[PDB]
Amino acid sequence: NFNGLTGTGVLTESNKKFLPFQQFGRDIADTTDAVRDPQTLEILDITPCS
Amino acid sequence: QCVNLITRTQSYTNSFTRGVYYPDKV
């Protein structure tokens, strides 16, 4: 529930470093693909488990 | 002292593709 982004998925580190003002990312299907950790700024991908 | 004010207008000086900002933090 990062800053109100409710969902379910597996979090994993990635090299997709966002911009300093950007918070989360989306794909061509308007689905959230990655989000940053508001405690320690790191990009974590959001993918369905199985 | 507040008595001075100068300005000029022409309704156009340039017209290019600028002023595009990030609409969201996505």
mmCIF file with all atom_site columns, C-alpha atoms in Angstrom:
data_model
loop_
_atom_site.group_PDB
_atom_site.id
_atom_site.type_symbol
_atom_site.label_atom_id
_atom_site.label_alt_id
_atom_site.label_comp_id
_atom_site.label_asym_id
_atom_site.label_entity_id
_atom_site.label_seq_id
_atom_site.pdbx_PDB_ins_code
_atom_site.Cartn_x
_atom_site.Cartn_y
_atom_site.Cartn_z
_atom_site.occupancy
_atom_site.B_iso_or_equiv
_atom_site.pdbx_formal_charge
_atom_site.auth_seq_id
_atom_site.auth_comp_id
_atom_site.auth_asym_id
_atom_site.auth_atom_id
_atom_site.pdbx_PDB_model_num
ATOM 1  C CA . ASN A 1 1  ? 0.000  0.000   0.000   1.00 0.00 ? 1  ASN A CA 1
ATOM 2  C CA . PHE A 1 2  ? 2.806  2.447   -0.870  1.00 0.00 ? 2  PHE A CA 1
ATOM 3  C CA . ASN A 1 3  ? 1.359  5.957   -0.419  1.00 0.00 ? 3  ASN A CA 1
ATOM 4  C CA . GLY A 1 4  ? -2.101 4.569   -1.186  1.00 0.00 ? 4  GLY A CA 1
ATOM 5  C CA . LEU A 1 5  ? -1.099 2.216   -4.031  1.00 0.00 ? 5  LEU A CA 1
ATOM 6  C CA . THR A 1 6  ? -3.046 -0.861  -2.977  1.00 0.00 ? 6  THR A CA 1
ATOM 7  C CA . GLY A 1 7  ? -2.151 -4.085  -4.744  1.00 0.00 ? 7  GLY A CA 1
ATOM 8  C CA . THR A 1 8  ? -0.594 -7.530  -4.573  1.00 0.00 ? 8  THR A CA 1
ATOM 9  C CA . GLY A 1 9  ? 2.663  -8.747  -6.063  1.00 0.00 ? 9  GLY A CA 1
ATOM 10 C CA . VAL A 1 10 ? 6.270  -9.773  -5.549  1.00 0.00 ? 10 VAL A CA 1
ATOM 11 C CA . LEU A 1 11 ? 8.784  -7.021  -4.815  1.00 0.00 ? 11 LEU A CA 1
ATOM 12 C CA . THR A 1 12 ? 12.283 -7.267  -6.276  1.00 0.00 ? 12 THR A CA 1
ATOM 13 C CA . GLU A 1 13 ? 15.160 -4.889  -6.921  1.00 0.00 ? 13 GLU A CA 1
ATOM 14 C CA . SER A 1 14 ? 15.828 -3.627  -10.438 1.00 0.00 ? 14 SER A CA 1
ATOM 15 C CA . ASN A 1 15 ? 18.088 -1.221  -12.310 1.00 0.00 ? 15 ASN A CA 1
ATOM 16 C CA . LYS A 1 16 ? 15.119 0.906   -13.446 1.00 0.00 ? 16 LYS A CA 1
ATOM 17 C CA . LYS A 1 17 ? 16.203 4.039   -11.565 1.00 0.00 ? 17 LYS A CA 1
ATOM 18 C CA . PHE A 1 18 ? 13.352 6.552   -11.709 1.00 0.00 ? 18 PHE A CA 1
ATOM 19 C CA . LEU A 1 19 ? 13.614 10.327  -11.770 1.00 0.00 ? 19 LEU A CA 1
ATOM 20 C CA . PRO A 1 20 ? 14.055 12.113  -8.415  1.00 0.00 ? 20 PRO A CA 1
ATOM 21 C CA . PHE A 1 21 ? 10.455 13.370  -8.506  1.00 0.00 ? 21 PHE A CA 1
ATOM 22 C CA . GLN A 1 22 ? 8.832  10.195  -9.875  1.00 0.00 ? 22 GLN A CA 1
ATOM 23 C CA . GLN A 1 23 ? 7.289  7.717   -7.430  1.00 0.00 ? 23 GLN A CA 1
ATOM 24 C CA . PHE A 1 24 ? 5.999  4.693   -9.367  1.00 0.00 ? 24 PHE A CA 1
ATOM 25 C CA . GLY A 1 25 ? 5.849  3.342   -12.896 1.00 0.00 ? 25 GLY A CA 1
ATOM 26 C CA . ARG A 1 26 ? 3.228  1.901   -15.219 1.00 0.00 ? 26 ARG A CA 1
ATOM 27 C CA . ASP A 1 27 ? 3.211  -0.182  -18.393 1.00 0.00 ? 27 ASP A CA 1
ATOM 28 C CA . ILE A 1 28 ? 1.339  0.252   -21.683 1.00 0.00 ? 28 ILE A CA 1
ATOM 29 C CA . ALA A 1 29 ? -1.628 -1.459  -20.003 1.00 0.00 ? 29 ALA A CA 1
ATOM 30 C CA . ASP A 1 30 ? -1.977 1.212   -17.260 1.00 0.00 ? 30 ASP A CA 1
ATOM 31 C CA . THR A 1 31 ? -0.847 -1.374  -14.692 1.00 0.00 ? 31 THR A CA 1
ATOM 32 C CA . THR A 1 32 ? 1.609  -0.527  -11.925 1.00 0.00 ? 32 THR A CA 1
ATOM 33 C CA . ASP A 1 33 ? 4.950  -2.194  -12.669 1.00 0.00 ? 33 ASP A CA 1
ATOM 34 C CA . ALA A 1 34 ? 7.339  -0.699  -10.088 1.00 0.00 ? 34 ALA A CA 1
ATOM 35 C CA . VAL A 1 35 ? 7.307  1.599   -7.064  1.00 0.00 ? 35 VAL A CA 1
ATOM 36 C CA . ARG A 1 36 ? 9.847  3.245   -4.767  1.00 0.00 ? 36 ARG A CA 1
ATOM 37 C CA . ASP A 1 37 ? 10.212 2.544   -1.049  1.00 0.00 ? 37 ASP A CA 1
ATOM 38 C CA . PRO A 1 38 ? 9.382  5.754   0.870   1.00 0.00 ? 38 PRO A CA 1
ATOM 39 C CA . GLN A 1 39 ? 11.661 4.721   3.754   1.00 0.00 ? 39 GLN A CA 1
ATOM 40 C CA . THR A 1 40 ? 14.835 4.097   1.727   1.00 0.00 ? 40 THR A CA 1
ATOM 41 C CA . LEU A 1 41 ? 14.652 5.298   -1.873  1.00 0.00 ? 41 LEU A CA 1
ATOM 42 C CA . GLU A 1 42 ? 14.989 2.151   -3.996  1.00 0.00 ? 42 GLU A CA 1
ATOM 43 C CA . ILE A 1 43 ? 13.068 1.025   -7.074  1.00 0.00 ? 43 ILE A CA 1
ATOM 44 C CA . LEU A 1 44 ? 11.193 -2.249  -6.542  1.00 0.00 ? 44 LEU A CA 1
ATOM 45 C CA . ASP A 1 45 ? 9.365  -4.013  -9.362  1.00 0.00 ? 45 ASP A CA 1
ATOM 46 C CA . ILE A 1 46 ? 5.778  -5.215  -8.939  1.00 0.00 ? 46 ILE A CA 1
ATOM 47 C CA . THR A 1 47 ? 5.045  -8.503  -10.712 1.00 0.00 ? 47 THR A CA 1
ATOM 48 C CA . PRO A 1 48 ? 2.347  -11.144 -10.083 1.00 0.00 ? 48 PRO A CA 1
ATOM 49 C CA . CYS A 1 49 ? 3.694  -14.185 -8.242  1.00 0.00 ? 49 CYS A CA 1
ATOM 50 C CA . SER A 1 50 ? 2.118  -17.106 -10.112 1.00 0.00 ? 50 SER A CA 1
ATOM 51 C CA . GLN B 2 1  ? 7.714  54.825  -3.566  1.00 0.00 ? 1  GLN B CA 1
ATOM 52 C CA . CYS B 2 2  ? 5.256  53.204  -5.981  1.00 0.00 ? 2  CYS B CA 1
ATOM 53 C CA . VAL B 2 3  ? 4.625  55.442  -9.007  1.00 0.00 ? 3  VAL B CA 1
ATOM 54 C CA . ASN B 2 4  ? 6.577  53.783  -11.830 1.00 0.00 ? 4  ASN B CA 1
ATOM 55 C CA . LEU B 2 5  ? 5.176  51.187  -14.242 1.00 0.00 ? 5  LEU B CA 1
ATOM 56 C CA . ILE B 2 6  ? 6.258  50.418  -17.816 1.00 0.00 ? 6  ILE B CA 1
ATOM 57 C CA . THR B 2 7  ? 5.127  47.661  -20.182 1.00 0.00 ? 7  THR B CA 1
ATOM 58 C CA . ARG B 2 8  ? 4.589  46.942  -23.870 1.00 0.00 ? 8  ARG B CA 1
ATOM 59 C CA . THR B 2 9  ? 2.490  44.371  -25.704 1.00 0.00 ? 9  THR B CA 1
ATOM 60 C CA . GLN B 2 10 ? 2.084  43.093  -29.255 1.00 0.00 ? 10 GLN B CA 1
ATOM 61 C CA . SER B 2 11 ? -0.322 40.124  -28.734 1.00 0.00 ? 11 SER B CA 1
ATOM 62 C CA . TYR B 2 12 ? 2.434  37.853  -30.091 1.00 0.00 ? 12 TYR B CA 1
ATOM 63 C CA . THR B 2 13 ? 6.223  37.735  -30.069 1.00 0.00 ? 13 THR B CA 1
ATOM 64 C CA . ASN B 2 14 ? 6.900  34.053  -30.781 1.00 0.00 ? 14 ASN B CA 1
ATOM 65 C CA . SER B 2 15 ? 5.046  30.775  -31.287 1.00 0.00 ? 15 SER B CA 1
ATOM 66 C CA . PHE B 2 16 ? 6.999  27.545  -30.733 1.00 0.00 ? 16 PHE B CA 1
ATOM 67 C CA . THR B 2 17 ? 6.535  24.162  -29.053 1.00 0.00 ? 17 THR B CA 1
ATOM 68 C CA . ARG B 2 18 ? 7.399  24.804  -25.408 1.00 0.00 ? 18 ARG B CA 1
ATOM 69 C CA . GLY B 2 19 ? 5.761  24.630  -22.006 1.00 0.00 ? 19 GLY B CA 1
ATOM 70 C CA . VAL B 2 20 ? 5.413  20.844  -21.700 1.00 0.00 ? 20 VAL B CA 1
ATOM 71 C CA . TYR B 2 21 ? 5.613  19.491  -18.148 1.00 0.00 ? 21 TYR B CA 1
ATOM 72 C CA . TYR B 2 22 ? 5.277  16.084  -16.512 1.00 0.00 ? 22 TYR B CA 1
ATOM 73 C CA . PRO B 2 23 ? 1.520  15.635  -15.915 1.00 0.00 ? 23 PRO B CA 1
ATOM 74 C CA . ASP B 2 24 ? 2.169  13.137  -13.099 1.00 0.00 ? 24 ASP B CA 1
ATOM 75 C CA . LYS B 2 25 ? 4.893  11.376  -11.123 1.00 0.00 ? 25 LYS B CA 1
ATOM 76 C CA . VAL B 2 26 ? 4.266  8.125   -13.047 1.00 0.00 ? 26 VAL B CA 1
#
